[PDB]
Design a protein around this ligand. Structure first.
Ligand code: ANP
Ligand code: ANP
Ligand code: ANP
Ligand code: MG
Ligand code: MG
Ligand code: MG
Lengths: 306, 307, 302
DNA sequence: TTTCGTCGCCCACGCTTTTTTTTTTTT
């Protein structure tokens, strides 16, 4: 995550760097990942200047066929934040993978928010316990953030109550556009420190409301595609683990409320089901590296256990 | 908290403010909540000055990344409107919470409207009962709004009828769009006043007959979702606690709340009420992000919810 | 009851009013209380006209909210037709509450049906009401019972007891139009109450079959939605009646449809001899108890 | 030293939504 000032020393002046920063490119990776057609619509950058900055950005960010034994080593070195439950972290063959998107969908009262709250504390656990030793981004679009759960999880894990709530940074999206701006601000502020997680609670819930009718289906899917592409860019350029949450719909018998856009974009999906009492069930979905099966986890006072 | 007028103090000419208010944006926070898609939809407001409506309003609200310590400090500010029972209080850990939606569902005679009446009384009461201050907003379609029960509940709490029944409203229109329109109007009603509880009992009772048959289900569910979302906006913007009771359907494949998968997610708290013995009922916390899976027996009496 | 000439003299002056009257939902309260979908299939296709009529006919008793004391006073002067017995002066808190939706069950054709051929004591007494109804789904209405009951009190008149009580209904799709057209004479003259004898008694006589049960339940939901609309708009006390099912797992026909579309339901049981013990059920402001009724050849009371 | 002319050419698809609804007594 090299800051945007890295290319400032090489060619690009301060004015252009400021224009990029106000555009939303707070890192060299964000500039390098964007196409040439996107570094043109932002005023203040010429076409030749755009090609120049693209060349300089590509000088540091690795692209193309370079080496893949190193990438296999990197995949073996994936952080794999643990869920906190012995069956959820085993069904996922380690837990939530980092650098990808882990959508979880269920009917209701299925433990999606409970899992997010547990992960917001477990991402601060060292690699010995399973985590990333970093902060926790919490984009919460339902007003469903209860720090008491985080304190309970921390006291279960024997961590300081003040530390976990100091690490966790919280923001609430009020619409889809504001969700995108919140994502941009998160990208801006994720370079100043290390963030081991990024939670988008009900990543597609305001889409169900803001876009009404069939006439807005294409625009809604395009906006959701842009949002998921931005989330993927955050996942690669930062190495964070994005655990987004999805709702469910009935086939007029359940299916995630996102179309094929979110089905393809989401690297992993989890189907959460209500079991008996406090226990629930989790099933893998659309995971290219995981089998299809079920799990067995419970919602205790200490987040998610068994 | 603050009026819409501040927007025209920032440098937008009053005609644009009146156009924004005509669409329903009776507060600066409300217009900030809506995205640019809902701002371009206002007639006479194009993409021009849209930034002057978005970022100028956003400069007056946080709309950013706080810390969890600050949110936990704000968590003490919550009023936590209190019920009438001590066991029920232990169930909800102090009572229903401020700025959230509680949906209570069950069969007939499960104490729903009694809970609504008692909660509105505690909202029209000092902090000693559990609610800070504010009027009680009623939105009745099922028809159980009998001010006889309001008068009866007023005797136990020792409040004169002049200052309680004149402080509570009523809904006359039995239409799905009527509740949304009346809540948009209650927005401007409450921006000039203070409110603590907002009750919409027939949250999904209207949709059982308004949209009948498979084929019209989708439009019904988009309508319900839009109503729920603007209800959540109203709850958050003014820190009001919302109650929305629900009906049940028997699974013929055994009672399930109606309008599922749309009201299930939106309702941040769900209370499942069962009939017990005599007149006592049992309230179980169906859905909650903080409260456990507990059950509390209460006994509706003349005083109120009772225990 | 607001049959004001404003409904036709407003900005809308065209065939739209006559289309609305012919569609079966007339009077102004058929507009501001009706969804937009109903104003689609009616003859005359204009979505702009829907909101035009809505704007021009939403100017009624406060619909842009109100205060609860304004109609709390209105329901302090409410009729509240007292029951035809002096034993229920403690229970029921007076009489049959007007503007509510009371439900009776426990019997098939006797019992609660007798409670249809009685009461109206407040109607006879002071002015006053002097009005009563009768609807049916599968019933055996007998006006001689009304004659005998009125003769018990000081209401000795004969013709005044007639020309009000409907006595029709055998098949659901037959009395669909009956409950549609009730308003056609309900607004011409003011009116007190409305019993629906054997209402939605056994829909499985015609609306029968698995898979069909859902459509049946939608039909009942529509019917009591209209019934609630009429009860609240005209300020009348409606009495729905059903029959038991003998649970094999003491409940009435209707399931969760009429269960969530009533106000003051109350079970009717059998006592000793002519004693018809009348227990109570869900009610916003009535403590649970059991009443004591009696039926005799003269009528219901004692 | 002199003195302007003269139009042609089409491309190219995107996007799912949404649950309802209880009968029925034997011996
Ligand atoms: N302290 C606690 N102890 C035990 N269980 C709890 C506790 N707090 C919450 N729960 C359980 O967690 C459930 C809610 O889980 P949640 O993660 O909010 O579901 P969800 O699928 O996110 N629902 P929604 O967000 O409305 O779509 C509750 O209904 C309880 O069963
Ligand atoms: N006008 C009336 N006056 C007095 N008694 C009446 C009158 N009408 C009906 N009854 C009584 O009601 C009785 C009906 O039989 P009952 O023993 O109640 O049958 P049930 O099976 O208990 N009732 P149901 O549930 O309607 O089938 C008659 O036989 C009479 O005793
Ligand atoms: N004074 C009282 N004393 C004791 N219990 C009471 C009293 N008033 C009301 N109750 C009880 O509280 C219940 C509240 O029911 P209510 O909340 O009206 O159900 P509902 O689901 O809204 N009705 P419906 O429209 O038929 O589905 C009553 O039915 C009684 O059981
Ligand atoms: Mg959950
Ligand atoms: Mg109730
Ligand atoms: Mg009968």
């Amino acid at each position: 995550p090299q800051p945007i000032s890295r290319l400032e020393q090489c060619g690009i002046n301060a004015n252009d760097v400021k224009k990029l920063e106000e555009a939303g490119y707070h890192t060299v990776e964000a500039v390098a990942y964007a196409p040439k057609k996107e570094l043109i619509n932002i005023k203040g950058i010429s076409e030749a200047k755009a090609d120049k900055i693209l060349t300089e950005a590509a000088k540091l960010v690795p692209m193309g066929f370079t080496t893949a034994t190193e990438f296999h080593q990197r995949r073996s070195e994936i952080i794999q934040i643990t869920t906190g439950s012995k069956e959820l972290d085993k069904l996922l063959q380690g837990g939530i993978e980092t650098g990808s998107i882990t959508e979880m969908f269920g009917e209701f009262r299925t433990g999606k928010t409970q899992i997010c709250h547990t992960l917001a504390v477990t991402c601060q656990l060292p690699i010995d316990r399973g985590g990333g030793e970093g902060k926790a981004m919490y984009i919460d679009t339902e007003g469903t953030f209860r720090p008491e759960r985080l304190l309970a999880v921390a006291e279960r894990y024997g961590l300081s109550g003040s530390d976990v709530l100091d690490n966790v940074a919280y923001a609430r999206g009020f619409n889809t556009d504001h969700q995108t701006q919140l994502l941009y601000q998160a990208e801006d502020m994720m370079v100043e420190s290390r963030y081991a997680l990024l939670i988008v609670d009900s990543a597609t819930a305001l889409y169900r409301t803001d876009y009404s009718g069939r006439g807005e289906l294409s625009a809604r899917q395009m906006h959701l595609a842009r949002f998921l592409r931005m989330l993927l860019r955050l996942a690669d350029e930062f190495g964070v683990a994005v655990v987004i949450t999805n709702q469910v719909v009935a086939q007029v018998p359940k299916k995630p409320i996102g179309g094929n856009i979110i089905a393809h974009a989401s690297t992993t999906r989890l189907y959460l089901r209500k079991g008996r009492g406090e226990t629930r069930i989790c099933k893998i979905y659309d995971s290219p590296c995981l089998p299809e099966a079920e799990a067995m986890f419970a919602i205790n006072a200490d987040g998610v256990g068994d």
